[PDB]
Design an enzyme around this catalytic site. Structure first.
Site, PDB file in Angstrom:
ATOM      1  CG  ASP D  69      22.279  27.755  76.160  1.00 45.58           C
ATOM      2  OD1 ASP D  69      21.584  27.952  77.179  1.00 45.58           O
ATOM      3  OD2 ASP D  69      22.255  26.682  75.517  1.00 45.58           O
ATOM      4  CD  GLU D 196      26.464  31.478  86.393  1.00 41.60           C
ATOM      5  OE1 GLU D 196      26.259  30.891  87.477  1.00 41.60           O
ATOM      6  OE2 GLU D 196      25.940  31.115  85.319  1.00 41.60           O
ATOM      7  NE  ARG D 211      27.086  27.334  88.448  1.00 46.13           N
ATOM      8  CZ  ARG D 211      26.197  27.244  87.465  1.00 46.13           C
ATOM      9  NH1 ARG D 211      25.592  28.338  87.025  1.00 46.13           N
ATOM     10  NH2 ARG D 211      25.911  26.068  86.922  1.00 46.13           N
ATOM     11  NE  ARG D 288      20.121  25.536  88.498  1.00 47.26           N
ATOM     12  CZ  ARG D 288      20.806  26.095  87.505  1.00 47.26           C
ATOM     13  NH1 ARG D 288      20.160  26.679  86.500  1.00 47.26           N
ATOM     14  NH2 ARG D 288      22.130  26.079  87.518  1.00 47.26           N
ATOM     15  CE1 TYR D 322      22.110  30.106  86.999  1.00 45.76           C
ATOM     16  CE2 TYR D 322      22.684  32.229  86.056  1.00 45.76           C
ATOM     17  CZ  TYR D 322      22.876  30.866  86.141  1.00 45.76           C
ATOM     18  OH  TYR D 322      23.847  30.260  85.372  1.00 45.76           O
TER      19      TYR D 322
END
Ligand SMILES: CCC(CC)O[C@@H]1CC(C(=O)O)=C[C@H](n2cc([C@H](O)CC)nn2)[C@H]1NC(C)=O
Ligand SMILES: CCC(CC)O[C@@H]1CC(C(=O)O)=C[C@H](n2cc([C@H](O)CC)nn2)[C@H]1NC(C)=O
Ligand SMILES: CCC(CC)O[C@@H]1CC(C(=O)O)=C[C@H](n2cc([C@H](O)CC)nn2)[C@H]1NC(C)=O
Ligand SMILES: CCC(CC)O[C@@H]1CC(C(=O)O)=C[C@H](n2cc([C@H](O)CC)nn2)[C@H]1NC(C)=O
Ligand SMILES: [Ca+2]
Ligand SMILES: [Ca+2]
Ligand SMILES: [Ca+2]
Ligand SMILES: [Ca+2]
Lengths: 389, 389, 389, 389
Positions: D69, D196, D211, D288, D322
């Site tokens: 990542d 975030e 968040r 999600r 997101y």
């Protein structure tokens, strides 16, 4: 600075080739959107081709055309006149499975319709951002021109249809400034049907030639004034310019009423010339093949079948399709009048050809003061493509 | 602001490399138009390569060259000098199977010829829109320079040929302003033949070096004044600069008449240097291979065979082709005079090579005040390509 | 408006990541030039990566690296800092197998060297057109910096080498304005060798750190004044910053003379910090792997081996290569001083890896007022590629 | 000229489609970055999508998602709203595995975080060059919003987190002008967790909805003043808007404290409407998938569970992810108030799907004065891709 666009449409004896994008030949190896319904509109600086994409590219599995028409992925995008609808030169416009776009002299205004059929929304972009909204007022596929809308002295006009596609529906004229709706009007037209208008300015009013998908093989015509008072009816000429249609010999014109008694249609266009008209049509009476443009004397105002000129642009061995109207802004042509131009969409693939996909290229023409010889600037792509294996 | 372009052509002892596009090497994997007849012309801001496309890409099935020469898909497009003719940086110019283009200081003017051979039309674009038209006046392949046209003080000049390609035809000089024809002239030249002129400004007049495809191995020359009164004839020098041609030893010059008694030709160029001339040519007397440029003292005005300088740019092991003239606008070079430049087209594929396709890359050179060593900036592509299997 | 660039180089405690192009990872599927020797220089508006291309693309047969170094196809092109060297965003600069480029505040000036080894020519472009020329003065591979040249108050300076690469050669400093050479100077440096300089402005003079490919493992240094009077010698610091080189413990510095007695070299850089210096180098004493930058107190002016700071940017498990210097124009950074930046080239393929090709990506860093932690922003590509099968 | 952005957020009854990029459908054949965490921010001229790339392209071996990542290849880049994240239209922004970006009216400021987890650095770009730096102050993954930062009257604000992701960490508010940090503040929030943030301006202050990845299924909220004095807490509404979360019936709101007692989270957003709030969330309480937006009366200021409006934008059969907040600058919308907009990221591939890769497309919506019908503008790509074989 706002574009005046009050001048008269130029009187023209023929049409010169403006551009040809060859998108599909190019699409064979390059990266080109599978598109549908391209159209042209001009700023005071450059002219652009707008189109609708599936989001998919030619020769890619996502060009499988089982992907529906009014899909959530459908978008309006644009490139410069002549360039193919390629990803890398494309500009994003709007979420849309039906669109209109036009420039007022300061910025581009676009209108994209998306959402569900029963409750569709039409978003107005001004200068690249949404500035306003129209919701479905009749709950039956809110939809619009698929050709250039029309801007006069800072206000932009266009025409939308909410209703069924094969019987009586409802029709409206919208007026925005800087992407805000500032006026609207309902259109009384019982018996008559209006789809996918082709419009342009002319003597400070908006003139449209549209599609009757209910019963008429002639094209409905309307003329809009800045106060949204209007006149509506049909192109008078005793010659049918829709597809499918019947024969010229077996047709009686009307200025008021559909004639021809045939169901389906196609988007097409026409230009007023004093009292004459340049009407375009496909060559085949039944299929979307070939394209030609006739000038009928006193055609805008009488049931005339007097042909003064005929010019072929796509021959009847080749596929045509939709077509629409736009003008060159005075700021580009230098003329003291509005130069009439049109584009012809050339559809390749489904329904007529054995591919899993459908798209179209395009050719653009503009009024000139001379006669232009007949030719065929047809699509050119060699079907089927690799993807079709 | 209009470009003056009245200054004299600079006197130069050699040519420096301007650019090299490598389109075909690049074309091996990237997305590059299969092109033909590229040429260079300059605005007061940047110089561009214009070209003609089939609409097809290198290494794609549509590059099959059974697709004719004067086809409906053929278009004029353009990129910046040095860049390959790639789809994603290409700008649309015109529908054309023959073209000229030039910039006047305000906008680009282009002229694209398309239509049927018997009745072709030449559309004039100004600032990216058609502004005027020339129809075929002799009904036999209306056609033009394929190199830069010439703009002086706001009016742009060029030369066209309507007629047969292997005998006597007709020739004209056109004068437009802001894309409107404002003057024309017929060219008396019985016995002489004019094709594909290479032109540039020089002392407030337009000078051209053209192609005789009838009988002469020398190049016809004309000099045009703003009132369209002209002088015409041949490059005086006792050295032949066409292909095919004979040997230098067996050749007698003329300022008035074709000499060499050979049929075919090629596009080429020449620059007046006071009374001297820089004439370019291929190295082979018979084939389009190699490229060199000779300076002959008193060559513009006498049957001189006095070589003052010789510079090789493409060696005779490598393919050349067409070549043409253009100048750097004063606004770019900073010189008080017009810097003479030329481009050489390098053709790969059919006829000489075993591919299904034909295209060309290019190299660009500009007059400098020094001698430049001989070298070979040849094409580079490794033939044949994947498509050829 | 001309860029002043008279301010002092900023004093900095570390370097922040500016950009990383990932060209070769991207090149795996996209259309990316096989490049070599990329470098960065800045206008008063944007910074650009310049590079040299074979004209070939990654993963294409033309990336076969049997294609020589100083080839006729080699060109200088450019993109914006951070973007990969892709065809579709690339700008053409010059014909070159060796290059320098810099911006003076009004336009870009580039210098590309091409032609035959025995008689090479260096073309000067100003604002995208050739404006001047330098011919080989010693007949032995005329060549230049491969990093940014330097512009102060409207005149641009750079350094070229004509001669052998492994013994004594000749060296010159050139001064142009608006792309016209207006001064030059020969550099007395018997015993010393100068290749591929990395330069930047500092207190109204040009400072360079160059490559000795003859005998010295320290870097030659020169300081140029606007009157082209100069001082020349070596970076004083008792620490060697070339590759190959010996160990720090077995090395004695010099301000005047090569030391280390080893042949080959690599392009590298250094920044004066008052009397300190930031010197960069590869981590390996023998191979082009890893990259780090040391600050030596009093290094510019004494044989100091006092390390005040050390920062790793490419770890010694990963491939490095060339590196060079440039500054941020005041107009971009907002500082009252010249922010020192450098780029590190990361070479993948031949000689160290089993591919038929060679290229490089890049990472860019700029002086900040803080210490930056060590990391490794290495190339990332997964070799070999499809083409290598 | 600096953007004021002091006006109030507009009160809105629904959201219209702004754009849809279709990157992944397009990515099937075209050249598109494998991206993650795209977000939108606007200049006074155009709006842009920013994203993070692996440097790899869809359908390429480098899209193998074993590539970590926070990798050294990760970069922040950008295109225009609506366009896919394609190489050829992409603009380089910064080296980053976490980013924020915003425009102040004069230039773009971006903040990219890169380096090692224990000692990360955050580089501030202004107008495309680094102008400043923030080092890790707590040594534990320095990181930021991944959505638009916020500019008021020339100073730009944003929020960063240094610490563990599953327990108590540290939080800061930064204030820069022209890319120079000019203020900072520590945030007392014991028990509470901030990751975030999604922020926007509102009445001359910055409002964020963030968040909580520690214990709370409600979203933490903070309100920042230009003097960096702040208020912090949670979105009062008695309805949870994080994923995973519990059921609405089994949830008690709080304005001060995390509630829900569940670990993980997702980036999301909310807009103050007087005392009401538009809160967005995924449809699934655990996954999600799907996306909807609820308006709760008095939600910003009380534990209200009074739903006034609910609008679906991605249906619960399709993948979401997101989402974040941004405003239209007054200079674009023409409104006297700040039009609230949001984007929803749609993730395809790992973890939920059998591909070697992960990326996302996007859809963008903006506040309108009308109700918009529910629909699903979902991703569209047909998985898996060629590469997955
Ligand atoms: C719905 C009314 C008619 C217009 C006479 O439908 C058009 C019939 C038609 C034709 O070929 O005549 C094409 C229009 N169309 C639009 C679309 C998608 O929105 C973009 C490809 N597909 N087909 C159709 N329009 C819509 C909004 O779906
Ligand atoms: C028609 C008169 C001659 C010019 C001396 O023909 C050219 C002969 C020629 C050559 O190789 O010398 C090439 C020109 N040409 C144009 C084209 C197409 O228009 C574009 C590829 N193909 N070939 C030909 N021009 C046209 C209008 O077809
Ligand atoms: C010729 C003198 C030396 C410089 C110390 O040669 C360089 C040696 C070198 C290295 O790896 O140290 C690389 C330079 N180079 C240039 C080139 C081509 O011009 C572009 C790829 N190839 N290699 C070489 N330069 C040229 C003009 O060929
Ligand atoms: C580290 C704190 C959390 C944020 C709640 O990690 C995010 C958890 C997360 C999620 O799916 O909720 C994704 C964020 N992320 C960033 C990245 C790379 O930096 C770009 C793809 N990958 N994942 C992660 N952020 C970083 C800096 O790695
Ligand atoms: Ca009908
Ligand atoms: Ca001849
Ligand atoms: Ca050495
Ligand atoms: Ca949570």
């Amino acid at each position: 600075t706002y574009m005046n666009n009050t001048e008269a449409i130029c009187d023209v004896k023929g049409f010169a080739p403006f551009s040809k994008d060859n998108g599909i030949r190019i699409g064979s190896r390059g990266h080109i959107f599978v598109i549908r319904e391209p159209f042209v509109s001009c700023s005071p600086i450059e002219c652009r081709t707008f189109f609708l994409t599936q989001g998919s590219l030619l020769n890619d599995k996502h060009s499988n055309g089982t992907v529906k028409d009014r899909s959530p992925f459908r978008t309006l995008m644009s490139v410069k006149v002549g360039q193919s609808p390629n990803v890398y030169q494309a500009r994003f416009e709007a979420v849309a499975w039906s669109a209109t776009a036009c420039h007022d002299g300061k910025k581009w205004m676009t209108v994209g319709v998306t959402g569900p059929d029963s409750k569709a929304v039409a978003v107005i972009h001004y200068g690249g951002v949404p500035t306003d909204v129209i919701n479905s007022w009749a709950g039956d596929i809110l939809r619009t021109q698929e050709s250039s809308c029309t801007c006069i002295q800072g206000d932009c006009y266009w025409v939308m249809t909410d209703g069924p596609a094969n019987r009586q529906a409802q029709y409206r004229i919208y007026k925005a400034n800087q992407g805000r709706i500032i006026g609207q009007a309902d259109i009384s037209f019982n018996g008559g049907h209006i789809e996918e208008c082709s419009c342009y300015p002319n003597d400070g009013k908006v003139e449209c030639v549209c599609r009757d998908n209910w019963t008429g093989t002639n094209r409905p015509v309307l003329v809009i004034s800045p106060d949204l008072s209007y006149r509506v009816g049909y192109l008078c000429a005793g010659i049918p310019s829709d597809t499918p249609r019947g024969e010229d010999a077996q047709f009686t014109g009307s200025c008021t009423s559909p004639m021809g008694n045939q169901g389906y249609g196609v988007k097409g266009f026409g230009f007023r010339q004093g009292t004459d008209v340049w009407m375009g049509r496909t060559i085949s009476r039944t299929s979307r093949s070939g394209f030609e443009i006739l000038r009928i004397k006193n055609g805008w105002t009488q049931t005339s079948k007097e042909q003064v000129r005929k010019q072929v642009v796509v021959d009847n061995l080749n596929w045509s399709g939709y077509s629409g109207s736009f003008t060159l802004p005075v700021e580009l042509s230098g003329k003291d009048c509005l130069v009439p131009c049109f584009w012809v969409e050339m559809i390749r693939g489904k329904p007529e050809e054995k591919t899993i996909w459908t798209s179209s290229s395009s050719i653009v023409m503009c009024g000139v003061d001379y006669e232009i010889a007949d030719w065929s600037w047809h699509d050119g792509a060699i079907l089927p493509f690799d993807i079709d294996k």
